[PDB]
Structure formats: C-alpha cells, structure tokens
Design a protein around this ligand. Sequence first.
Ligand SMILES: OC[C@H]1O[C@@H](O)[C@H](O)[C@@H](O)[C@H]1O
Ligand SMILES: OC[C@H]1O[C@@H](O)[C@H](O)[C@@H](O)[C@H]1O
Ligand SMILES: OC[C@H]1O[C@@H](O)[C@H](O)[C@@H](O)[C@H]1O
Lengths: 518, 518, 518
Amino acid sequence: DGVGSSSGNWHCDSQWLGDRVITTSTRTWALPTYNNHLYKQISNSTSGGSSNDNAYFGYSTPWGYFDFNRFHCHFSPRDWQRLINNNWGFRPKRLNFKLFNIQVKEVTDNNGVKTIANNLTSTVQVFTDSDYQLPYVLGSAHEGCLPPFPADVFMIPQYGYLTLNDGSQAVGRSSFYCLEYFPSQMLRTGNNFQFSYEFENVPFHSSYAHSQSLDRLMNPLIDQYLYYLSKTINGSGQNQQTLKFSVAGPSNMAVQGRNYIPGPSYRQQRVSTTVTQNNNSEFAWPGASSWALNGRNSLMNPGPAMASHKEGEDRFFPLSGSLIFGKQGTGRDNVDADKVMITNEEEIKTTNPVATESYGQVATNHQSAQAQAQTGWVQNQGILPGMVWQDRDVYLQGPIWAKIPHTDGNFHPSPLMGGFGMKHPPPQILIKNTPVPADPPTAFNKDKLNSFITQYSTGQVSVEIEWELQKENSKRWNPEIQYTSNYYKSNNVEFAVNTEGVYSEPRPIGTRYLTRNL
Amino acid sequence: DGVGSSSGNWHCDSQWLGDRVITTSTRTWALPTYNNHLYKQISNSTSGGSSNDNAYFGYSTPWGYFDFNRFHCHFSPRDWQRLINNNWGFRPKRLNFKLFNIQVKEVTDNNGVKTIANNLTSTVQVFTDSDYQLPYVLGSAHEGCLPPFPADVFMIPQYGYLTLNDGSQAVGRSSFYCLEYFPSQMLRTGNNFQFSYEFENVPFHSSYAHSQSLDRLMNPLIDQYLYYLSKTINGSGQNQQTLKFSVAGPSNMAVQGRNYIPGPSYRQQRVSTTVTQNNNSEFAWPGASSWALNGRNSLMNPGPAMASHKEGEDRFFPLSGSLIFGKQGTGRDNVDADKVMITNEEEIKTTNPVATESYGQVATNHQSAQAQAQTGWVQNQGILPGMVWQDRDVYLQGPIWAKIPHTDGNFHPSPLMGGFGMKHPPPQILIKNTPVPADPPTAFNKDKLNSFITQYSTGQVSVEIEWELQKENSKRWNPEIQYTSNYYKSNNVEFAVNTEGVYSEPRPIGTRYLTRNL
Amino acid sequence: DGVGSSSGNWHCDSQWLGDRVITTSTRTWALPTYNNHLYKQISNSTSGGSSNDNAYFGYSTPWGYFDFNRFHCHFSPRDWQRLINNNWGFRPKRLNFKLFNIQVKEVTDNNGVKTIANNLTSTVQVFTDSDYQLPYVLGSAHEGCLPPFPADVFMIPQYGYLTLNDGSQAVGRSSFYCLEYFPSQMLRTGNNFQFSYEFENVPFHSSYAHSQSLDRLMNPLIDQYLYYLSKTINGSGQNQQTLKFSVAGPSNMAVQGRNYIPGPSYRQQRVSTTVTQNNNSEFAWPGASSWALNGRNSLMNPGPAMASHKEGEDRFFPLSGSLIFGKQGTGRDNVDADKVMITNEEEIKTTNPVATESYGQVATNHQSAQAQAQTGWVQNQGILPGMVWQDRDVYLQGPIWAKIPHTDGNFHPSPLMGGFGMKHPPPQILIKNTPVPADPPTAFNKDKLNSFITQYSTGQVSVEIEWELQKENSKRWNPEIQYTSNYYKSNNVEFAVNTEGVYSEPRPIGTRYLTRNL
Ligand SMILES: OC[C@H]1O[C@@H](O)[C@H](O)[C@@H](O)[C@H]1O
Ligand SMILES: OC[C@H]1O[C@@H](O)[C@H](O)[C@@H](O)[C@H]1O
Ligand SMILES: OC[C@H]1O[C@@H](O)[C@H](O)[C@@H](O)[C@H]1O
C-alpha cells in the first residue's frame, strides 16, 4: 500500500480447541546483504581444512531463508506443558506465513561514523520453493531459527548448499543453482507477503510412554500351553544326555513364547558422566559407531532410536546416540559437560533395545557329542518380522520435521533426529534485499557492477501452525507423571528472563509423560 | 427373564458355504471366586524366586476371562481337515459371543460336609474391554481356553496383568487398574449376555506349501544371458591370474542371477531327538538364542519363521525355534520327549532359511596380490530388499490371533507364534460373580467387609466365528498330499475319547498340504 | 491512511446533559524506549535495599502504559465544582479511548550533538488487556497519569509487575509474562487506534454529607417507651443495692435504644500539625497501625474509612489514615508539612467512628458482690449486624477506580483509597515502539541483536468518559455549603498557570458539600 500504513499486526496468541491447537508467533527480523551480492563456489579447499570425511563442494548465495523448524518457535514452555501433559499425540496440519512491515535501510559511512537512513524505494524479494527444486537445507538441524522468546530480534541465516564432490573438486554431475532464476515477489515498504501450506498426512507423534514392557505381556497367574527345553543332561557324569521339557509359566518368564520382539539395534559406545569411569585414551572418534558412504565415514549420530541406558544407569549415555543441546551462553568448542544438556531416550526401554548393549545372542555352530554349543553377540540387528519399536522423542528445543529424501525406497522414514518426515515438508522461504548500485561510470563499461549501496532490511514474520491433538482415553486408576515446575526458591524463574535480560531454557523437555498399555 | 426359563440353547453346528465357514461352539463353564474378592500386588518377591530375567511386578484380580483363542475351540478335527485339505487360505471375519443359563450357587460348610444350594438373587457381572483399555492377556499363549472337546466342563481362568518394574519394585510409571472402574452388565439367573465383533482386515493365512523352491525358478532348458566370473587363475603356478567369464545355465544353477532372495534369519542351536548325538553338558539356557530388553534376557522362543531342519534331518529341531505342544496328561516339569509334541516348519524350506544354519557368507576383506579372499558366516540377517518369506504355520492346537502392540512402528506384524495380528483383536470378556457379604455387625464399623458368602457360578458360552475361505485354483496334474487318518488297527480311535473318558489329540495338525507355484 | 493526513482531532469539550456528563480530554504524549528493548528480572536485591517488609521480586518490561485513573484527568476544576455542588452522586458509565497522529522519530548522535529526524516506516504497537490476563498495575495509585492541565506534554510510564517471592528469590509458583505474547495492533504514521469500554454496574459515589448524626435520629420532643437501668445503688452505705429503671427521653439521649450503630474501626495513632504537641521520639513506623501478610508488615495506610478528627480537633490527623497529596514542585523525600496537602474525612463523623479513638467499651468480667464491673477499650471492631458507614471521599487529585482482587470472597469491595471497585475495571492499554535493528553483521550470527536505532514516539490520546449523575431532591430550607473561590486579591489565580508557566492545584477538593438526611 503506502509508506505511512502498517501492512500487518503482531499476532502471538495460541488457542486451544478440543482436538486442535493453533499457535501463532510473531518475530522481528533483520536481513543483511550476504556475499557482497555474489554467488561463490565454496569447498573444504576454500575453508583450508583437509580430511576426506570432511571434504565438500558447494555454493554460498546472497540469499537468506527463514527457519521456524524448532518447536520452541511455536510453543511457549507453558503451552508445551499443556500439550505433553494432556495428550497422547499431536501432528501438524496447516501452516500460514506472513512477511509485513518491511523496512529497507541505507547505511552511510564516511570518516568512520555511520548514518542509517530509510531507503523508501528499495525492495526486498521473497519466494517459496514450492516444487522442491532447490537443495533442501531445513532438514539438517541448523541455527538461525526464530528465537524461542518473542521479544528477541533475530538475524536471518544465509542460504547455501552442497552438491557432489570428489575431494574439493566437483564432478560433471554436480549442479549449480541461481536463485535469481526463480520468480520472486518484490516488496517495498508497504508491501506484504503471505502463503499457506498443508502438511501432508503424517502419523501422530507418540507423546506417551508405555506402562508395560514388551517382555511382560502375559498373565502372571497362568501357565502357557507351550513347552521349552529345560534340561539337556540327566546329571553330572559321562553319557548323561536327556531331553526334558517344562511348561513356560509365571516362575520362568524369560523362556516363554512371545509374538513380538524388540526393534532394531546398531550398537553405541557407552560413556559415563562420571569421568573417572571412562577409559584413559581418546576414543571419541575412534570408538564411535559410523557408516561409510563412497569412501567417507559419517559418524552415526542419531542412529536408530534406542533406550539410552538401562535402569539405574542414568550416568551412562551413548557416545553419539543422543541429542545434545547447549545451555544458554555455551561456547562453540570443547565445552564441559556442565554447559551442555544431554537428553535421554529412557522411556522407550520398554520396546527398544538399549543403545549400549548387544541385541542378543545367536547360535554360531552345531553342537554335537564333540562340540559344545557356541553363541555370539549380536552387535547390530536389522529389521525382523515381528519387531516393534518406538521412534525418538520430540523436544521443545528440537526439530519439528524433515524432508524425506526422494528415492526409490526407504523404510519407516521417520527422521532419526526426531519429528515428522515428509516427502513435501514446509517449503523454504528465501529472502534477499535487492542490490542497489552506486553511481556507475559516465562512460559505458561492460563489466558487471561491483559497487553497491550498503543496505539491510528489517520487518516482522508471522507463522501460524494448526496442530491436531490425540486425547488420552486411559482407565489408569493411579495418578500419572506430569511435567512440573519445582516450587523451591530459585534465584531465577525457570524459562524466564535473566536479571540482565537473557532468556534461557534450563533443561530439555521431552514429550512423553502420559502412559499407555503396550 | 425368569427363574424357570432357559435363556439360551446349545448350538455347536458348523456350516460350510462356498467361500465361508461358520463355526459355532457351546461349552459349560464354572466360575470360582478369585483372590477372596481382592486385588493383590504380586511380584517375583511375592513368588519368592529371584532372577533378574524373571523379575516382574503386577496385580492379580478377582475377575476372570474367557479365552477361545485356540483353533481347536472352533474346529473339530474333521472340520479342520475339511479346511486344510480343500483351501489355499482362510481368515476370520465376524464373531458372536453369548453367555446364558447362568446359575449362581451358595456353598455351605459346617462340620466339614458341604451343601450346595441355588442363590437365585445373586448376580454375575460381565463386560468386554472394547476400547482396549486393559492390559491384553490373550496374546500370550495361555491355558484356560474353551476345551476342544464339547462335552468337557472348564474352569474360567483368573485375570491378572503385569506393569513396569525394577526388580520386584514398581516405578512411578507403573499403572494400576481396578476392573470395577468399568461399566459391566449384571446378570441373575434368567439374564443373558451377548456381543458381536468384526475382525479387522487381515491377510489370509497361507494353507499351502510351495511346489517350487526360491532357488529353482528358472527354465532348466535355457541359458541366461548373464555372465559370472568362473576362473580367477589360468592354472597352477606363479603370476597366473585371469578373469574368465561363463554363461550361467542349466549345468551350474547355483551361480545364476536371481531377482529374489530368502527371508531373514536369526540362528538357533540345533538339537537332535537322538540323544547320544547331543553334547554332554547343559546348553539349554546357555546355548540359547535370546534378545535383551532393559537388561533382561528373553529367550527367543518363536523367532523368525524358519525351516526347522534340512532334508532328511527330521531328527533335528531348533532349540527353542519351534512350538512344542504337550500330549494329554503330560506333566508340567521335566518331561521326556515322548510326552511332548515338537512341531516342524519343514514346508517353508522353499522360501525360508533353515533355523539352525547360517544365512550365507559375506566378504570380510579386500583380496589382493598379498591377501587371499576371506569370507565369514552370516549368523543373523535382517530384512533386505528382495527378500521373500512365509510366515509360521497354524495348528489346530495353536493360537488364532494376537494383539499388535500399539507403537510408532512395526514390521510385518504377523504373530511370531502364529495366526493373525490385529491392532484391535477380539476384545477381552471379563467375568466375575459379585461379592455377597455375610451378616455384618449390628454396630457400625468403617472397615471394609472381609466376610462373604462362598459362591460360584456356572453357565454356557456360545462362540460363533465366520471364516472366509480362499479356494484352490490349481492346474496340478498329479494328486496332492492330504491329511488322512491311517486305517490300521488302533486300540483307540484318534481324536476320540479314551476308554476312561479322556479326550486326547494324538498329534499336531498343521495347515499346509495343498501346493502352489512359487 | 497516509503521511500527510491527520488521523484525529483535538477534542477537549465536556457536555452537561440532564442525568449524564461526558468529559473528553486530549493530551500529547511521548514514548521512550524502555530497558533497551529487554525484559529484566528485578528484585530488592537488584535495588540493593534489604528489609523483609520491602523485599520483592518481579520484572520490568520494554512496554509502557496509559493511566487516566485520576479525576483531574477528566475534569477541569470548574467542571469538578459543577459536579460536586449540584449532585448527590455520580458514577462512570462508558469509556472511549483513541491514539492518533503518531510520530516515530530517529535520534542520531555523533560527536555529542544529536539530530532528530522522522522515521516514517517505523511502527508503534498497542494492545489492551481485555481478559485481565496481566498483573493489573492501575489500581495502586501511581504517577504517570495524563496531566491535569491540557497543555502539558507527558511521558508515558514504564510497565512492570511483581510476582511471588521469598526474600529476593522467586518460587516455582512465580509467573513470568512476555507482553510480545499478546496480539497487538501495529501503527505507522497515519494509523490510529481506538477501543470502547463499558463500566460494569457500580454504586454511585456519595457526593453528600449527612445533615444528621447516627446518634441523633430521634424525636427530641418525645420519650421512648423503653427503659434503661438508671440506678444500681439506693445510696451511699453498705448493702445498698437496687435496680432502678428510667424512661429514655430527651433529657438523656445517650442511653436511648437505637436500631443502628456506627461502622467498623481499626485505630490509628493521632498526630498533631502543631509540632510541639507530638512526642519527642520517632514513632512514625513504630507507632503505626499495620497488617501482616506471610511474615511481612504492611502499614495500614488508607484503612477503613473513619472520621479524621473530632470536632474542633482539625489540627489532628491519623498517622497514615488519610490520603496525603503533594503540592506542585514538592520533592520526593523528607518534605515539610507545608509542602504537602493532608486531606480530612471530617464529613463522615456522622456515621463513622473517629480514626484516632476507640470504638467503644465492652464488659470484661462478671460483676458480683465481690467484683466491681470492669470495662475495656475496643481498639479495632469488625463488622456487626446493624452497622452503617460511609466510604472514603473522592478527590479531584485522587484515583477513580480500582480492580477488585479475584478471590473467593470479599466484603464491600469499595477501594480503600477511594472510588469505584470493579471486577473488570477499564483495561490496561500497553504501548511500545517496535525495535528497529541497526545494521547487522554481514556473516551470520545466532546471538540476538543487541544493537538498535535510537527512537521515540509522540502522539495524542483522547479519553472520553460518560458519567451518570444523581440529582439532589432536597427540601432543605436554608442554603447549603458549596465549594467556592475566594474573592480576595491573590498574586495568582487559583487553579491557573504560574507566571513561569507552571500549573498548580492549590488544595484538595473533596466531593461532599450537599447534604442529606440520615
Ligand atoms: O580420521 C577421521 C576423523 O574424522 C573426524 O570427524 C574426527 O573428529 C577425527 O577425530 C577423525 O576420526
Ligand atoms: O541366567 C539366566 C537364567 O535364565 C533362565 O530363563 C534359565 O532357565 C536359566 O537356566 C538361566 O539361563
Ligand atoms: O522494621 C520495618 C521497617 O519498615 C519500614 O517500612 C519503615 O519505614 C521502617 O522505619 C521500619 O518500620
């Protein structure tokens, strides 16, 4: 419309209907010029680091993008609690996005003091990649998200992508993308932008833990009608061999026949938070579970979902097998365990094998009168018919969704870091403020113009997501575990602002509190 | 209605339509009072046995439940034969249940002689758990089923369940259930009960065996157009290396290219019924294939479906890899092989690996001029794209269905003991005769009344199941294997009553007789 | 609309209809940035002062709010006089609020000389808390109100709130509020804001004084038919005891029977404005009437409404029992009595006990032949059936309304400082100018942006209140006390501007001039 009118309003409310929640968040953003208006080839050679596992080839762009893909973007800690205490499941349904109240500003510097003024005629240009024609960066869990606390003003992250490489070099199959080669909407002060999105059908996340374990499904009062082999020798001596069979029953539960077995396993190395119990050596990379692709070793960071420890073993965690979040103000490199938050998958110990344990034992030979029976430990176990498992839990700090890679086949394409896998996830919103040249020469030159006016833009983003809820039907008599605040005398309220104005999130909050039968 | 009228009739017929069978069974039951009208916390501590694998925590209830979940409940041996000889497949469709002609009886004992009288005003109360809000006990294969022989009167089994535990202790996530906290129908003599159930869509059980093996699918008369590496050395000597390639053809079938491979394997230890061929040692538990869950080892009793032995090896069976049924009158503990019936999965040797064999071999290294080629045995193999398998066979003595555990994911949720997996299986029917207090004090006391009239109830159950049939279309010229009775001079007719009045089932009858092409 | 159009007009008129008055006020405001765009935890620890009575915990916000909650906002001194001379009562009815002609301005400073320019694209955001979901700050009588004189330009006060504390620490029950978590309307130059409000039904304020006292309601000419005990002894001597009864009549009025008694009392310490008559000691805090809450002592500042002094005792006032207003230009701390204005409740001496007196006397024992009759002084008296009282008077300088605390119970929830109590008072209007970032880095950083453009906003506020009037019906023959200006030779007109341009209010003006029968 015009310079004097606001093109949108601040909308942060969240409304709770019966089966649905609608969260709306508004933030203030700032967009710098990136790469001096250039596309740039980037590689580990451009970075200077040399390792085959770390080699890459790609491009950085002048563009930037919006990321609302963490839950704390859409939920207050109080709202998150209302979700996880009262519901068996939730999934996203619809999405609404807005850009409004856009301000482009010119920066003028002369002797070292800078002046900021409005440039009213400058434009910022925006588009969504709806056909998923760009490398999709939102699936990897990166920073640059809308801040969890509504009063914080955030910088928009720079867009870049990777393609095929051999070492630092490219190959003919490597592809280059100019984002100017897409249609984008141009917006001056007084123009606004919006689009809507429908989440494709996904299963509900399971916000519950099981109140039963897969190995105790039976009636403790009744015998099975099935027999197992109890004795193979009549006693001590020579040539003592029998086949004795017993009924499986309450007295021996481990031996009963069962219809279903725990899910797959890929074993992790066990690390103690008590430090004297760890080996004295550097095992971090060497002792790590990894997978190889085209000669590169990728550490298996969030591998298959597994129980992080056995009972009472809480000090133990898998080496890379769990999500690790930083506390507010935590540095980038070589930080103590105190400054990081290690989440645990403990609730899924009912259907899932422990991450640091073998799956089980198998027979490795044929016994005979000559040969004793030999077993071996199953370190990794793929899917078997009759396996049953839970996915990884969801966190208020964690990612909401991921893009399922477009491929001939996949199995159970739930994101291993967590959340909802989608062939067509919420599209990428790419934003850039358009280059404004400085004064060109007065005689013609064919070289592209490398001299521009220093600018940046600010504005507001609204994101609205509808969430479908799955209510708890339970007949459980005794009360249940809920997420609570503790009452006792803190210096600071948790999930509140600091005395210096800093918002922090004291601990990770998982989704799984309510219980179901297994 | 009233004391003098029958509230139902005896209905045992089974009617065979073209595509469907309807089996109806009627039995007479007796219901005791369980637990002295109490709910009781039970654990391995209450049982006194201590092993971490066998530890449990749960509750026993005053309630009891009906189990018709074995096939011999619904099929006579003659009906079972008509099913398995004439049909390629079957599945359950509808279910109808009735309770009628209910009689509550008071037991009076004074000096040690007891008198039984009718209590006409007493009531028995019944409900089905339709929302699956209770721990589901019918999936584990327990005793307490309707007896296979219609003239036998059976005792109703006591209901109980398990929940989470650490050792014998519970955890806050453990859940307690009062069955009085459900609505239930009360029934006096003259009241009857019924409900209907729809089986959710399940695949047909495969009542056939394959007439082809997965490794012979080819035309024996024709060569492939594909080549394999036949020779790696030109001959004996030094520096003799070649690559020689041959056509795969009828002469060498093992090396041909194939589109599909056999199903997954988890290896079992091999045990001989000839006893002198077994090792002299106790390998039963130690040499057993197991899986671990939260620190407990559960023996893998009916693991993935696998051929129980190779050809001519019938004396061999997997250590726990097969269902083991007892003969009539067989004791509970340490019984000889003669008194038990070991079933075999032999028919599936066409698509499935043998339970006691390795899946195959893989390369463990890179060969080179320095290093010879090394292989290793694959003891367990998870699912691979292109695998093809058969499920475990169904038995007249075996379970019909199971409840699929409610979870984020599962694969091929066919019950490993056998039958039809269902998210919503036939619901549990829970029955209890209501407590009738003895004479209370004449001055008020707040304690709950612990003194009751000794009672029990009897009545009849009808169960009606419709089964959908899949007829055989085969073009096979030669006659086929059928299930038969042998003609020769027994002292007793098989599947008949004893001279003392005892009904026995002489052998397990599987489903797989007719054949199909693979 | 646009940059060149005014979005509202100046409206200050007040129109007098028969039963209603409509006051409209327009002011010019200025809004700074508060807290550097931060929320900040604040406590007596952050302030450094330590006393348990003064301990607090809370938050300061970047937001600010409008306060029109004093009468001089809505009434000129002439209008106030027209109200209080002609009417028995008044109450508020409707409310209309407007924000318009909004101007955001950028402040640029380099070498220490600052330049102010218009920022045309900046926005200010406004919302009302209509659901009363925020801590309500307008009830406490704070500064920051619209100035009484229309030509003064006022600064908008900063919003902040308190929550639960133990000492300077918080508790788990303490709650934090982000105001960005509400929907708010954004407004650029050319946008305006308005909303309407309905006062919920409140009683009229009593703008009258009683022309009778509660202890003289009788006919002075007539006797009562009731008797009192006049004599207990026949005379001087031993064993002189009688019961003598007399008629209560005009000669002895104190002893007559009465249907109604004066209202409740909580006694205050008496302080003289003649200073030599006060004790020589510091009794201010020590000799003060207080109430205790959770271990803290809160001085009872405007306690129950009571007559401030007896007749002719005008020099006396309760220690904290009355509202104390400052004269124009009066300092914050340790100011002489000359610079402050002490109001008096004198008019209510008819129905209300004096603040500095005991309520009365009660019997403390049983008299007998052995024991003389003993009485004791009633220092505080709660409500009794048959009590009758007046509320505190209203002042042109005083507060209009208060929010009744949301609670299970309350009694006579009239605000003790004065005015109209409401469960849903006029809502809080919260205003903030939105942060405009300075130029962000050209490489992405995840830290929130702490660098902003210095801004402030100005504009106009209109407030329109309809007041319902209660006209005087009186039959009084003699003329009545009115509020007047004195005619005699001042250097300055009262309620006028200074010679230096300063507006002052010379004295407090109460509401109670006209009289009624009691
Ligand atoms: O040699 C490959 C390297 O890979 C890196 O990811 C790791 O941090 C190094 O310690 C080393 O393992
Ligand atoms: O040590 C665990 C035990 O588990 C039982 O199920 C088994 O019968 C024992 O022989 C032993 O293996
Ligand atoms: O000891 C509590 C204190 O409370 C304050 O409000 C007062 O000004 C002090 O003089 C003292 O009474």
